[PDB]
Structure formats: C-alpha cells, structure tokens
Amino acid sequence: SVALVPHVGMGLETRTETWMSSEGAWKHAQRIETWVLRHPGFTIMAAILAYTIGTTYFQRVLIFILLTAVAPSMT
Amino acid sequence: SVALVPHVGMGLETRTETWMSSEGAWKHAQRIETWVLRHPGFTIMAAILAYTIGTTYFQRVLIFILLTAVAPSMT
Amino acid sequence: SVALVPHVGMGLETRTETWMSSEGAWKHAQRIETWVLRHPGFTIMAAILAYTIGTTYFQRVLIFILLTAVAPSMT
Amino acid sequence: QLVESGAEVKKPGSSVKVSCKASGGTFNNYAISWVRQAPGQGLEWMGGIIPIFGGANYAQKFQGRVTITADRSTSTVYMELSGLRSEDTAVYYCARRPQSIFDWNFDLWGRGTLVTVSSA
Amino acid sequence: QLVESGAEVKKPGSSVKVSCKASGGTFNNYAISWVRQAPGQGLEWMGGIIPIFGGANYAQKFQGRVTITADRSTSTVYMELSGLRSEDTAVYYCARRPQSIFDWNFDLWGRGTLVTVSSA
Amino acid sequence: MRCIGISNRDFVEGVSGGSWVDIVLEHGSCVTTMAKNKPTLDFELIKTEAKHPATLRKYCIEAKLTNTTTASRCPTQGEPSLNEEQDKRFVCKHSMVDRGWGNGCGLFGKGGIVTCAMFTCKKNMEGKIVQPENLEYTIVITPHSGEENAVGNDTGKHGKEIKVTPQSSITEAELTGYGTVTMECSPRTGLDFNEMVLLQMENKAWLVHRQWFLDLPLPWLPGADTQGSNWIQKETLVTFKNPHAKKQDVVVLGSQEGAMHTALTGATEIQMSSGNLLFTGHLKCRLRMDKLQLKGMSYSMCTGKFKVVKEIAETQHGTIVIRVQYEGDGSPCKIPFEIMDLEKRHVLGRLITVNPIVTEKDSPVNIEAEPPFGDSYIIIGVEPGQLKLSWFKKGSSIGQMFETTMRGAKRMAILGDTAWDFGSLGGVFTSIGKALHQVFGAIYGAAFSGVSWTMKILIGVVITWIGMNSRSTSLSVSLVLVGVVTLYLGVMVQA
Amino acid sequence: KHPATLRKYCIEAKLTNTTTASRCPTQGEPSLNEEQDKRFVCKHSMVDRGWGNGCGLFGKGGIVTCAMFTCKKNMEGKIVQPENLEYTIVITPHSGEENAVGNDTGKHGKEIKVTPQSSITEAELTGYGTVTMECSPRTGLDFNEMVLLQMENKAWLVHRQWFLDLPLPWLPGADTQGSNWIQKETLVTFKNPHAKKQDVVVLGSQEGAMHTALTGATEIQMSSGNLLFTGHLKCRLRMDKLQLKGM
Amino acid sequence: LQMENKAWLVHRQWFLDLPLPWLPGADTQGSNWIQKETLVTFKNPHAKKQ
Ligand SMILES: *[C@@H]1O[C@H](CO)[C@@H](O)[C@H](O)[C@H]1NC(C)=O
C-alpha cells in the first residue's frame, strides 16, 4: 500500500505542523502495543530467543525489542 | 491506518488463495529493498552498530537484519 | 544471437546425420586457434597466470586451457 | 457580503434567529457585531463574534438572553434573541469591524432585518 | 435466453461482428458455438468457446478468417468475420451446449443473425 | 468420475473393520475413496452456506464533515465549551491558538480553542456474524462408475447432493445401483464460526478473524443502530490541523476502501450477495460404506469387441483414463479390463473405475486405471477381438513416495491436527499422533499467531542455528527439528 | 508560479471489458487481442483442464485475463523552478500609532515581494527612511527536490524522490491521451482461488491510503496559485537608510 | 520447428529459450510479438538523438 511508505524522515520539515503529526506521532507505538497484547505467545518466544542469542543484557534487550517491533511490521 | 494491520498471521488459512496473497507475499521485501536503496547512509550505520553491539558474527548479522527491517517499518 | 546457443547437447541425436554435424564439429577449435594466433599477448598472460595459480602441472595446464578457451568464447 | 435574513414576524415569548452571510475573507479576517435599533429610538449594540475564533461577546443588557454563533462551514453568523417582547420590535443590523479590541470601525453594515413582535 | 444482434448488410472484403448475449448461468457453466447456414444449404459449424475459459475453437474452413470472443463483464459472446464475400452471405446462429468435449447438444439457440452483401 | 481433472484430488483406499473411513473434504479438493469390495466414489464439498447472519459492527470507510463550529477562550480563562462536545454525531478537538489585542482578547497568551464538525458516513463495512448452527455444507457424492455423464463434470445429473448441518450431521445418500452411503460429519469442529466475522465491503466479502475485525482502527457502529449518528472512533477518519497557532481546522481522511483492501490481504474472499456462500474450508466426515455395493457384480464378461473412441489420456495423478465403446451382444456385461506386461504374464496396474460394465451397447464407458511406472499394456476385451494398448508412465516409485510425503506434509500444514483424520480408520498410532499434534499445534499457534511468513522464516533460521550450535544432543535435535518445521511452514504459508 | 506536471498517479480506477483466454495443457500460452493494448491490465495463470471442461489433455492449462483499466481520480504532482518563487514579507515598525499594528495590508505595515530576479528589495517606510532587504530565496526550500502534490482540492509539499517512488499507476506527466497507465498492477487484483477460474477486481480507492502516506508532509494550498505557508527565508537587513520617526 | 521449406526435430526447452521475438501460437493476429527488443537495436551514439 501507499500507506506503508509515509513521508517521514524526508528532511523537509519546517516549524509548520505536518499533515497528521499529532495522529501519526504515536500510532506505530500504539500498534506495537496492541499487537503485543494480542499475541503474548510471540513476545514470550522472542524473550526466550533474545535471552539465548545475546550474551549481554544489552544485546538481549536490543534483540527482544527489535524482534517485537519487527514482528508486527512485516505482518 | 487499517492497511497497517493486514490480517496475515490469523491462522484461518485454508487451501484456497487468500485475498491479494501473491502481492502481499513479497510487498514487504520489496519495500525494505527500496528503502535500503534510497537510504544507504542508515544501512552503513546499522552495520557499524550491529558490529559494535554483537560479539559473534551470528548476532551481529541478526542485529543488522532486525535494524534494517524495522528502520523503514517504524516509519 | 540464436547462433550462440546451438542445438548441441540435447540428447536427441540418432544414427541419422544431423544438420551441420561435420561442418560444426571443428569450428570451435578452428575459431579458438585463429583467436590464439591473432592474440598472442593474452595467451602468454594466461600461461603466466596459470603457472602462478596452479600448484601442480595438471592444475596449471587445466587453468591455461580453460582461460584460453573462455577468452574467445566470452566475446 | 453582509446579506441578512428577511423580515420575520414573531410573537411574545418566542425567539427569532437572524443570520448574516459573510464572505470568506470577511469571515476569516474581520469580526461581526449585531446592532439593534427599535423604531423611533437610538442605535444599540447587542454583541459581536470573531468567526474564526468563535467566542461571542454581548452587551450587559442582552447578556443571558442573546446568543451569537457562526458556522465555519457556511461563513454565516447567526443572532438568536429569546424571550421576545414588545420592546424587541426593531431592525437588526450585522456590522463588520476589525478583530482588534480597540478597532470598532463598522465599515460594512447589513441591510437590516426588521423583527416585529406582535400577535397579529 | 440467448439474444443475438440485429441483421447486418456488409460489402465484399469487409468484416461483420455478431454478438450473442447470454444469462449469467449459461455464460459461466456452458459453451457457445457459432453455426452458419447459407440460404438453401445445410448448417455449418464455424467454432465455439467456453466463455469462462476463452480460447475459441474454429472449423478448418474458417481457420484464419473468424474470431470468436466473449465479454465476461457484459456476459456477451462476439463473432467477427474478416474478408466477407458473397459466398459468406448466410444466417449465423449462436447456440448453447455443455462445456464438455464429448457432448455437443445445442439445446438452446439464438434467433440467428443474417448477413447479406447486397441491398435490402 | 468428478475428481478426474482436479489437481487437488486425493485417493483414499481401505476402510476399517466397520466399513467406515475418515475423510476431510476441502472446497478446492476432491476425494476418491476405494475399498476392497466397494464401488469407487468421488466426494466433493461444493458449498458452505451461512444462514441468518447478524451484524455486530458497521465500520465507516468514507465519511464527510459538515456544520463546523469553533469556540475559544481568551488566555488564562480555561478551556472553551461547545454545545456540540456532548453531541455524539460531532467530532471535536481542543487546541491552543495565539491571542492578543489584535485578535481581540486584551491578554497575551495561548487561549484555548475547540472546533467541532458533524461526522457523517457515506460508505461502511457491515461485519456480519453467523451462529455456528446455521452453517450448511453441500456434498456431492458421485459414483466412479464410468457412465459418460460424470467424467470430471461439475453437474448433478448423476452426482447425489447431500446437505449437512450441525443439527442433522448424519445423512445418507441413495446412489442408484450402488446402495447407500452414510456420511457422519462434524461441522462444528470444521471452521469455528464463533471466532469469525463475515465482512462485506461494497460488492466484495471476506471471512475474517473477529478479534481482528473488532481491533480495526476505523469508526464503528454496534450494528443495532438504524440511524448512525453515534459512531465511536470518529477521530480515526478525521484530522485536526492547527498549523502555527492561528486557526484550527478539521478535515476528513478520504475513502478507506483501498486501505481496507490492503488490510484484508490474507483473508479468504467469500461471497455475500445472494446469501453467505463460503467456497473455502474443510469438512471432516466419517464415511460408512457398509450398505454400499458394486453395480452388476452378477454379470457375465462381455465376450465381444470394444473400440477405443477416445485415446488414452493421462491425468495429473499418475492414473490413466480411456473411453471405450462396445459392439458385442450381451448388453449389460462386465468389461474385461486388465493392465499387464507385454507377455501378459503379470498384472501390473489396478483400475480405479472398479467393475466397469457396459450398460448399453452404443454408450461409451470411460475407465480410469492406475498403470505402473514404465511400460504397461491395457488389454480390453477377450481374445476374438481383444485390443491391447501400450502405455508408458513417466514417473518413478521413489518420486511418487516423495510426492506422497510432500502432500502429507502440506495437508498437515493446512489442516493442522485435522490431517490425522484424513483416511483414518481408527488405530492407536493415529490417535496418539493426533493428540501429540493437538498439543504441539496449541503451543505453535500460541507462539506464532499474528506473525508473517518472513518472520516465520527468520525465526526458523534462528531456532535452527541455536539448535545446531547446541552442546546437548537432545536439545540440539529438538531445536533443529522445530526450526526446520518452522521454515517449512513459513515457506508454505500465504502470510 | 508556472508549475509543470511531473507525474499523475491513479488513486481510483474502474475495470471493464473483462475477457479471458485459455490454452490446453502442454500447448503453450493463450492469447487475447486485448494484450496488444496497454489500456488492459492482463495476467497469465494456470488452470486445471481436462475432458470435463474441454481439453483432450489432463494437465494445467494456461489462462490469461485482461480488463480495461480506467482512471477515475488522479493525484497529480507538479514541479516549480526556483525562479518562479515569489516571497511576500511585511515590515511593520514599532510605533504606537496602531493603525497597522493589527492590519495585514499596507498602511504602516509595508509588504514587499522577494523574487530571485531582484536580489535587493527596497521598502520605503513613511517617517523611517528606507529599509533594504537582501534575501536569498534560492537557498530556502530546495524546490528542485520537491513536488507540489495535489489530490482532490488538497496539496502537500513532498520529496521528489519519495513521490516518484509511490506504488500506484501513473502517467508520465507529459501524457496527453491519459490512458497508458504504467503500474496498473498496483491497483488491480487477480484471483485464481482453486485453480479453476481467473478473475480481476479493481482493488478499491486509495485516497485515504494516500492521506496516511502523506503523514509527515506539510499541507499547502494549490486550488488557486500554489501558495505555500511553510519554510524560511534568509535575508540581510540593511538599516543604513533607517531613521527614527520621532527624532 | 520449420522455418523456410526446412524443418528440424528440436528439443522443446531449447526451442522455448530461443532469444527471438515470438507469438504464443494461439495468436491468430501475428502482431503482438513478445521480445521485439531481440530483433531491433536503438542507437544513441552521442547522447544527441535516439
Ligand atoms: C447543520 O447546518 C445546517 C445548515 O447547513 C442546518 O440546517 C442544521 O440544522 C445544522 N445541524 C446541526 C447544527 O446539528
């Protein structure tokens, strides 16, 4: 969809507010939150996989966060 | 929008072609590829960060892939 | 050109004489020989490279023959 | 550019709603106020509206009995007077003025909408 | 029901397209064939088509000269003749049969479109 | 003979001690069942009607705005109020504009402002729901006889149509000349319509997950509303703009039909114009062949000359079909059909049109047989005019085994644990496997719900790598197996 | 001013004149006459064939479906050269006179037009001398990398590359016939559910999807004259000829 | 495969891989060739005209 390629990060922003800045500011985070609520099974598996792969708490937390954020995204 | 929650991992798939299945199979991969083409700078930074954070080549590559996949996705 | 993909190794041959069998039997060898005559410089370089890369005489000769055959073919 | 509603007859105890159609520029740049003049009497200011912002202001007398609203989808300002009585028989004009608090320059006036209060 | 287009007068060397509309059930569950009859002569099968599938089959005599097509949006079957001549003057029928290679019963026929190369 | 010409045909051979077999019927698939002494039958699930659907929510995919009004308070006087903030057919927003002597306040600062516009719907999606007891499955049973009226046809001249419901789930089909077949189906465990919505948008419909339908980011009505005027998430189809701080506007967000189409990828499209017709899904039935008999077993071999009126044509399933006419004298007679070697010393293949018989003289009968891999000869008739037909089958037995295993894996990928009821005849191994699959599928669906196919491939690779780089052999093997199964499922899924 | 059309996308289409053709198994591809025309979006697929549906063979036959693609609503995008880039500035001195304290047009507040044609802009402020402005309208918004995207009485200032990368049917912008849409496959769907039949649908209307995709872009006005109310302008202010009024 | 009063017995995949413009074989129009670019060459020697 065209909706999958928003005009964010293009470097044309001014002081003027954008098309849906207030709306689209937190919509991705809300989506990831709703998805994690609806699918606790994948979050637990991602936590286990992140703990296993990462040797350090930073690597593990980063892997878990990225897995959780990308699972709905590809979805 | 609604387009960002596209009824994929819902577990209701039979042996019948789903709606827009052929397109949606590779649409996200095409989007990631086009984004990486248009934004080489972020990919280099993601590779550097993945190398730094990960100690083993496996988790370095995993971090790089997760970062690259979620960079356009968060948009 | 279609001439660069002849109907050679198709496993259809019978006892019957094929289209241009006698004529095309030695055309490749003749063309390679003529090219190696017209371009001695590449043959010497190929021999040097084969000697440099090949550890044993068999490897050197195989590499030299393959380079000399491919050079005209890729053109 | 300040076309007003036609003359309406009313009866005591009822409310009459008058309208002032305004141009796009007038609606967004200027402020409109409502002045009523009962026949044989002097001019009187009921209130005004800055249609872009929408907060209406009213005279001390008409406060609690007059309502002024504007429709941003139509570029119109409506004056609403309730509890009509005999004294309310008057002509109502919708005038134009700048948005500044100190500027009360009624350069443009409405055609005037006579409102009659009588059983008839 | 199988409704055919009206009669057409053509000239030698020209082309005529004959239409044959059909109901939804007969379009998607059957096959439509075209058979001509020169006046005072027997029926001659020209070709047919399974509109749901397309890819018409043509008689050897009309190979390269006829084109049968189906409009799925309008549920109509079209026949086009190229190189019309006097010997091609005849009435053309569209007939409905099952979409199987063994059964060729035209249980439903159109009225028939007559193509003439002279004046009426 | 209906399954001839369908790529997804299945061959089910054998029954249990009770003369029954477990078959799962899918819409795009055909099942042909064979037992030692029973006629060959073809089973097709040709319909699934949902009746009496009730709406549970109407989403707005395209709206308009009218009656826009604004209120504002000069700075430090609190937030403004509009009468329309309590009106449910209005969408409102609170912001701050810049006020001052020029704007008409007398104080300088950020003065609150609120703007409201009436929200109206112009097009909506009605997500109907249906009770699981209102589902009706139509199943056609056609005997694989050879009579010309059934060679791959999709008509009901010879096929028998039996309607199966959750209430009357046991039915029998009277097959003229073959006895009766009893179907004992379990539609309730078929598709679980209590967790699904029938989504009709314009002239197109989909079958969707009810949680997914209830989580949609569009405005909705409960479905009991007859006037609209109480849409819920009206803020999703509008955007309020206060560029800088001088004005506040509100606009609608354009038709959402295409965004809905994109959101519907992975939902199987259904039909909802002339009733709720679902040409997707499966039905598990237990097939009872006990009162099922071959037609004409009390016939004498033909002893006449057959002619092949249609050359032998091979199907996608490794079997062959041949159409032969009869010109002998004993009209109803068993057709002497055999598939032998050149010397006619061994019997190499089995026929599928079991007990072929000529019901009428000039009435072609087309037999289906399964010849062996490589050379084989189809012999039709007796010696006085016997015809011998050479055939060659291109495949291999190892390749056939590989394809059978792949079809089994794909059936498990699509039916999950219901694939253990396909061709089942009881048995303890089947029950143990189905229980194990049920538990493992519960875990797997919990861990992989809502995940796309690329994510499944990535998770499979990650798990396989973890297992391969594992010090313990048991955990290594288990993780490698789970990861490979995950990879196969990700490559097979449409998600 | 003087914008040029760069590309016209399709956000809403209709399909008509749907036709199909099939080839029996092993006999190659089928052919429609409609595949010659670019107004038709065509698709090739395989369909189960056999004696039942009209082939003497029993394999996967070839099928092609074509439909006439027609646009119903456009998302035109336009490009302006930096030369046609008028800027309007208003200079109001801090007096107390108040006539132009809150006014927008003239009076005390003198408004000037800045264009790349003239580097120096001169405003004579009554009683204050002359204010000299040296603005660089070229180094503000990089209009060589921006599109004035107009979709149904709304406009956005978008990145040119982001715009050219949009996945919709489009026309080159030089187009005149308005019928040779390029990416017609992004707005049409082909369905072959069970491998028995192939069909085509026009896949909805993308106005709302575009609205979502324009998140992060600044709305502009393009109904009359392509007005922008976003961005900056760097100017050098010359007070040499500026004098206090009351001195 | 027959070309001009001459015919050959050729491999099917080889024949389908021939880099020439082609028609489906069910065409009947003979005008919508597939890969015409194999039988034409476009010239832009100096980036002046094509
Ligand atoms: C909306 O405005 C129309 C005039 O455009 C008016 O007739 C109607 O009463 C209004 N409805 C409201 C404010 O609910």
Ligand SMILES: *[C@@H]1O[C@H](CO)[C@@H](O)[C@H](O)[C@H]1NC(C)=O
């Ligand atoms: C499309 O079909 C219409 C009939 O509905 C016909 O008039 C028109 O000529 C057709 N156009 C094409 C390009 O096939």
